[PDB]
Amino acid sequence: ENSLEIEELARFAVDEHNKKENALLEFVRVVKAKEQVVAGTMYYLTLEAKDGGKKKLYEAKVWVKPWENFKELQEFKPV
Structure with a gap:
């Protein structure tokens, strides 16, 4: 698991959750x-x-198709 890729995906999760649910979670x-x-x-x-x-913990599920610019937040929730 390349930690750089995962950092970008984690930020994408928080950003997509904010867009989708009209929130302002600050990624740590x-x-x-x-x-x-x-x-x-x-x-x-x-x-x-x-x-x-x-500071709070969240679980996110993120689907990526590496052959397209497809990234999809499938679910986002507190643990």
Whole structure:
């Protein structure tokens, strides 16, 4: 798991969650990441984000098709 790729995907998760749900979570870092080869790659991320300036953990599921510029936030939730 290339940590640079995962950092970008974690930021994309927080940004997409903010777009989708009209929120303002502030990305802090990735804690955990699992890649699972599928039709493309599926990522299960555990990350820190600040809610109201309060650090919290979230789980995100991110689907990537590396042959297109396709990245999709499948789910995002507190742990």
